[PDB]
Structures are given as structure tokens and as C-alpha cells.
Amino acid sequence: AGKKVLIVYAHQEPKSFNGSLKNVAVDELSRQGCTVTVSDLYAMNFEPRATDKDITGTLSNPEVFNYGVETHEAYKQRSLASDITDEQKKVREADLVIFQFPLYWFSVPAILKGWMDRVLCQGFAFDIPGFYDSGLLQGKLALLSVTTGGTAEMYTKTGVNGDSRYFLWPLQHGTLHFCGFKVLAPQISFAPEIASEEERKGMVAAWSQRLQTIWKEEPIPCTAHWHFGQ
Amino acid sequence: AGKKVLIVYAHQEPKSFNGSLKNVAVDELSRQGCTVTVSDLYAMNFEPRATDKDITGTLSNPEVFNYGVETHEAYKQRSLASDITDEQKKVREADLVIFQFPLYWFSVPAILKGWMDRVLCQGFAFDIPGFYDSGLLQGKLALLSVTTGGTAEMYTKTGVNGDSRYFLWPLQHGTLHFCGFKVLAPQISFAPEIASEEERKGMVAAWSQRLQTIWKEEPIPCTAHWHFGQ
Ligand SMILES: Cc1cc2nc3c(=O)[nH]c(=O)nc-3n(C[C@H](O)[C@H](O)[C@H](O)COP(=O)(O)OP(=O)(O)OC[C@H]3O[C@@H](n4cnc5c(N)ncnc54)[C@H](O)[C@@H]3O)c2cc1C
Ligand SMILES: Cc1cc2nc3c(=O)[nH]c(=O)nc-3n(C[C@H](O)[C@H](O)[C@H](O)COP(=O)(O)OP(=O)(O)OC[C@H]3O[C@@H](n4cnc5c(N)ncnc54)[C@H](O)[C@@H]3O)c2cc1C
Ligand SMILES: COc1cc2c(C)cc(=O)[nH]c2c(OC)c1OC
Ligand SMILES: COc1cc2c(C)cc(=O)[nH]c2c(OC)c1OC
Ligand SMILES: [Zn+2]
Ligand SMILES: [Zn+2]
Numbered sequence: 307a308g309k310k311v312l313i314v315y316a317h318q319e320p321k322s323f324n325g326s327l328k329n330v331a332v333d334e335l336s337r338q339g340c341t342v343t344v345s346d347l348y349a350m351n352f353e354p355r356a357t358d359k360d361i362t363g364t365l366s367n368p369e370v371f372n373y374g375v376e377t378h379e380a381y382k383q384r385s386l387a388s389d390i391t392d393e394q395k396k397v398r399e400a401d402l403v404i405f406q407f408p409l410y411w412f413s414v415p416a417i418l419k420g421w422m423d424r425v426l427c428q429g430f431a432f433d434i435p436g437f438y439d440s441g442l443l444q445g446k447l448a449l450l451s452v453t454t455g456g457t458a459e460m461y462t463k464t465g466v467n468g469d470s471r472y473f474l475w476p477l478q479h480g481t482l483h484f485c486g487f488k489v490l491a492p493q494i495s496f497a498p499e500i501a502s503e504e505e506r507k508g509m510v511a512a513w514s515q516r517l518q519t520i521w522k523e524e525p526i527p528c529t530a531h532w533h534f535g536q
Numbered sequence: 537a538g539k540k541v542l543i544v545y546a547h548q549e550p551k552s553f554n555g556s557l558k559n560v561a562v563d564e565l566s567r568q569g570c571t572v573t574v575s576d577l578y579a580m581n582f583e584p585r586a587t588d589k590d591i592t593g594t595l596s597n598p599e600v601f602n603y604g605v606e607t608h609e610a611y612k613q614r615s616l617a618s619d620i621t622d623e624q625k626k627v628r629e630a631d632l633v634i635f636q637f638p639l640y641w642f643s644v645p646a647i648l649k650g651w652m653d654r655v656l657c658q659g660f661a662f663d664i665p666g667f668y669d670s671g672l673l674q675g676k677l678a679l680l681s682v683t684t685g686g687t688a689e690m691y692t693k694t695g696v697n698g699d700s701r702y703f704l705w706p707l708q709h710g711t712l713h714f715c716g717f718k719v720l721a722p723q724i725s726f727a728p729e730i731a732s733e734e735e736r737k738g739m740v741a742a743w744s745q746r747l748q749t750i751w752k753e754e755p756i757p758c759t760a761h762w763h764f765g766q
Contacts, residue, residue: 318587318588318601322602354585354646354647354650355581355646356640357548370549370552410586410653411649411706415653416646416649416652416654417586419640419643419644419649423640423645424646426641438696463760466668468763472702472760473710475698480703530698530702
């Protein structure tokens with residue numbers, strides 16, 4: 307039915323497993339009659355650096371640059387760079403934001419980290435006060451769809467990498483919940499490179515099949531308990 | 537002495553509290569007679585995107601681009617882009633790598649994420665085998681000197697942000713420990729912007745004092761227990 311989805315996609319190679327997961331999301335959401343938009347960050351040469359080029363107006367303090375102060379004021383005055391406002395319009399319209407990426411250093415690739423740093427500015431995504439459950443993107447859903455090099459077993463509490471949920475914390479809690487998003491359970495596609503060709507097709511099908519009923523899902527409780535236990 | 541230090545610094549404004557912290561680290565380590573080098577990433581316009589420009593010459597598989605495979609092959613065949621190779625020479629020579637940055641979204645700014653993603657490549661920082669305790673940079677020390685916008689009290693386990701140690705995990709453990717580093721206790725300068733002209737000088741002065749005895753320090757046990765445990 308009547309939903310708008312933004313997929314923020316961070317992989318260099320269209321033929322990759324990430325590209326397959328993004329393409330199946332588009333195909334299935336499209337099939338459902340949803341509105342779908344993809345921000346293909348590498349193809350867009352998306353600027354990840356937080357710099358003074360992100361404000362085009364008179365600086366609030368031209369003597370000592372403070373990226374958070376200057377972008378907050380620029381957002382209110384409409385003087386942010388247009389690549390930022392282009393992504394902001396997509397997020398604003400979206401009911402669900404899916405992030406599709408390979409795990410780099412237990413986190414997002416820098417090009418996507420740059421999307422979070424620059425697009426989710428004060429005034430647009432949160433305010434002080436106006437964060438966590440009162441964040442400005444309240445009402446919207448977010449979902450991380452992550453691929454890893456490590457196996458599910460490496461990503462357990464007693465495994466070497468620790469539990470998968472541990473690395474989710476700065477993303478689900480520190481970023482998405484902070485901006486007010488309700489967070490759907492992560493899609494984690496373990497070790498596609500080590501899996502067989504059929505185990506891969508299976509992981510792509512499993513994502514497609516989940517997407518069929520994504521509008522029926524409740525979010526996670528995005529708490530310290532959920533991520534860490536005890 | 538005879539020790540080498542690399543400071544990887546990620547802040548746009550030389551007059552910032554981050555800039556002050558970097559400058560006192562240069563001043564004090566220089567005073568002790570250490571060899572000191574600073575990678576000032578915003579001044580270098582450091583590239584954060586992981587792309588096929590990171591390999592010069594021609595590719596291992598030009599049909600399907602795999603960043604990890606290609607940069608592993610390029611490292612071995614000495615055909616990585618010169619910005620990467622320049623940083624790897626700094627790291628190879630360094631006995632201690634200090635990361636100086638403001639926390640962005642419970643993590644490093646994207647410009648710094650990009651240095652970790654691009655410089656810490658397979659064959660250089662890690663391989664199979666050679667990770668965690670046996671990572672390729674074993675013997676070297678690493679230290680995160682982070683400033684935050686939130687207060688220490690927000691960064692307690694039952695506070696709004698959770699324990700600081702929770703966000704340190706993907707950086708200290710998933711990145712630095714993985715590559716072989718012994719991780720020195722992070723230096724966390726909580727909410728400098730809400731603090732006095734002093735308190736701030738207190739904070740800078742304490743970073744300078746800690747640096748006096750930095751070579752006597754023992755690394756933290758970089759384990760799940762240290763980050764999450766009882
Ligand atoms: C800087 C860097 C940091 C990293 N850090 C981490 C980390 O911290 N933790 C960790 O676990 N991993 C890490 N990795 C590894 C990375 O997460 C994995 O390599 C990545 O997740 C694999 O996803 P991919 O799309 O690149 O896989 P691909 O190699 O593209 O996928 C595997 C295979 O599936 C094929 N395929 C594509 N579509 C389909 C389909 N329709 N059906 C069947 N097969 C298909 C592909 O062509 C390929 O042959 C890191 C990698 C780099 C480069
Ligand atoms: C995208 C983004 C994401 C963020 N995400 C997070 C997050 O997840 N969690 C979080 O807690 N915060 C977050 N922050 C806020 C950020 O971490 C802090 O704003 C930053 O850490 C403050 O350090 P600074 O150097 O930038 O401060 P400054 O503003 O430069 O420091 C405060 C004052 O100290 C002055 N000063 C400089 N040198 C000295 C000195 N020698 N002695 C005394 N004073 C001096 C400065 O001029 C200034 O007036 C985020 C910010 C942005 C922009
Ligand atoms: C930094 O690169 C990689 C890092 C990791 C880390 C930190 C943990 C892990 O379990 N697997 C990895 C991996 O896959 C085997 C990588 O390369 C593909
Ligand atoms: C994205 O920006 C900010 C984010 C945070 C987060 C996630 C937690 C926190 O405790 N403080 C923050 C902060 O300091 C006021 C920021 O700067 C405005
Ligand atoms: Zn949460
Ligand atoms: Zn560790």
C-alpha cells in the first residue's frame with residue numbers, strides 16, 4: 307500500500323551482493339505499490355566531509371568555525387549546501403529509511419557516515435531539547451540492512467567480534483533513535499563471500515520475503531538492555 | 537625518546553578545543569624529544585571514500601569491483617594511491633598513534649572514518665591470520681582522544697547515551713585491537729563547550745600532564761568485559 311521508502315545505499319559495485327539486496331528491496335517495495343527512492347552514494351560522488359563549504363551564507367562566527375553551530379543556523383536560514391537539502395527532502399518524505407551497506411570497521415563506510423554527519427543536522431533531525439523519543443524524525447521508521455565479512459558465529463557474545471548487537475549501538479541508538487526514528491530489527495546478511503552461491507540466493511530471497519510483511523513489524527526497543535543484555 | 541608519534545587529527549578549526557588538544561600533544565611530545573608527525577585530515581582535504589581510484593595501474597578483477605580484494609592485492613603489488621601509502625608509512629614508523637577528534641554520532645567524523653577504512657587495509661594492518669592480539673600493527677600503541685557534546689553523566693550505563701565504553705567498542709576493539717594495537721585508556725574530554733574558560737584549561741592541562749608519563753602506561757584489556765561487563 308501507500309508508503310514512501312528511501313534506501314540509502316553505499317556500495318561501489320552494482321553487481322555486488324549489496325547491490326542485489328538493494329535491487330530486491332526496490333523490486334519488492336515497487337511491486338507492493340510503495341513509492342521508492344534510492345540515494346546511491348558512491349554513484350552520486352556524495353561528499354562525506356563536514357566542512358565550511360556546507361554553509362553558503364554569512365557565518366554566525368567567521369572567526370572560529372563550529373560545524374554544529376553554523377549548520378544549525380544555515381538550516382534555519384536555508385543556506386545549507388543543496389546536496390544536504392536534497393537528502394533532507396527525501397528523508398522528510400519517507401515513511402521508512404533503509405540503509406544498505408557492508409560493515410566497515412564495525413560501522414558504516416565513511417561515505418555513509420558522511421551522509422549521517424551532514425544530512426542529520428540540528429534543526430532538521432533533532433534539536434536541543436528534541437532528541438531520542440522527542441527527536442524531529444519521530445513517526446518514521448529506520449532499518450539497517452548490513453552485510454559482513456565475519457560469520458554469525460564470530461558475532462556472538464562469546465565469539466571474537468562480540469555480539470552483532472554491540473556494533474549496532476552507535477547507529478541504532480546514538481544516531482537513529484536520537485533523531486526520533488523507531489528502529490526496525492536489523493537485517494544482517496552474514497559472510498556472503500564465504501557462503502555458497504545458493505546460500506547467497508537464499509539470503510537475497512529471505513530479505514525479499516521479509517519485505518513482504520515489513521509494514522506489519524513492530525520496532526525494537528532501542529535500549530541498552532536490548533543491545534547489551536544483563 | 538627514542539619514540540615516534542603520529543597524531544591523526546580531525547577538526548576543521550585550528551582555534552578549537554580539539555586544535556588546542558592537538559597542539560599541546562605536539563608541544564609536550566616535542567619537548568620530551570619524541571619524533572612527532574600530524575596528519576591534519578581536513579587541511580589535507582583527505583579523501584574519505586573507498587573507491588577504485590585507491591588502486592593505480594590496472595585491477596585484479598575489472599569486471600566485479602571488490603574494494604577489499606583489490607586493496608589487498610594493491611598493497612602487495614605496491615599500487616595503492618599515494619595518499620594511502622603516505623599514511624601507511626606514517627603509521628608503520630609510529631610507536632604511538634593518537635586520534636584527536638570530536639565525537640560525531642557516537643563515532644569518528646566521516647573524514648577520519650575514511651582514513652581508517654582506506655589506510656588500515658588488508659596486508660598492512662591485518663590479514664588471515666593476524667588480527668586481534670596477532671594483528672599486523674602489534675607492538676604499536678593507539679589512543680583515542682575524543683571530545684563530546686554530551687556530559688559524563690549522560691554517558692553512564694543508565695544515562696540517556698549509555699556508558700562511553702559502549703561507543704568505544706567499534707573503534708577500540710573492532711578497529712584498533714583488530715589491527716594489533718595496544719589500546720591506551722581513551723582520553724575523553726566531556727562537553728568542553730558548556731565548560732568554563734578554566735575547566736577547559738584544566739582539561740588541556742590534564743591531557744598535557746598525562747602525556748608526560750604516557751610511555752609508562754599499561755594498555756587497557758581490550759575485551760568485551762572491559763567495554764560492557766560487571
Ligand atoms: C574497509 C573494510 C572494512 C571492513 N570491515 C569489516 C568489519 O568490521 N567486520 C566485518 O565483518 N567485515 C568487514 N569488512 C568486510 C565486508 O563487510 C564484506 O566484504 C562485505 O560485507 C561483503 O559484502 P559485498 O556486497 O561487498 O559482497 P560480494 O563479494 O559482492 O558478495 C559475495 C558474492 O555474491 C555475489 N552475488 C551478488 N548478487 C548475488 C545474488 N543475487 N545471488 C547470489 N550471489 C550474488 C557477488 O557477486 C559475490 O560473488 C570490511 C571490508 C572492508 C573493505
Ligand atoms: C555531526 C555531529 C555529530 C555529533 N555527534 C555527537 C555525538 O554523537 N555525541 C556527542 O556527545 N556529541 C556529538 N557532537 C558534538 C561534538 O562532539 C562536540 O560539539 C565537540 O566534541 C566539541 O569539541 P570542539 O573542539 O569542536 O569544541 P570547541 O567549541 O572549539 O570548544 C569549546 C570552547 O573552547 C575554546 N578553546 C579552544 N582552545 C582552548 C583552550 N586552550 N582552553 C580553553 N578553551 C579553549 C573554543 O574556542 C570554544 O569556545 C556532534 C557534533 C556534530 C557536528
Ligand atoms: C577490515 O576488514 C575486515 C575486517 C573484519 C573485522 C574487523 C572482523 C571480522 O570478523 N571480519 C572482517 C573481515 O572479513 C573477514 C574484513 O575483510 C573482508
Ligand atoms: C548530532 O549532534 C549531537 C549529537 C549528540 C548525541 C547523539 C548525544 C549527546 O549526548 N550529545 C550530542 C550533541 O551535543 C549537544 C550533538 O551536538 C549538537
Ligand atoms: Zn535507542
Ligand atoms: Zn579488544
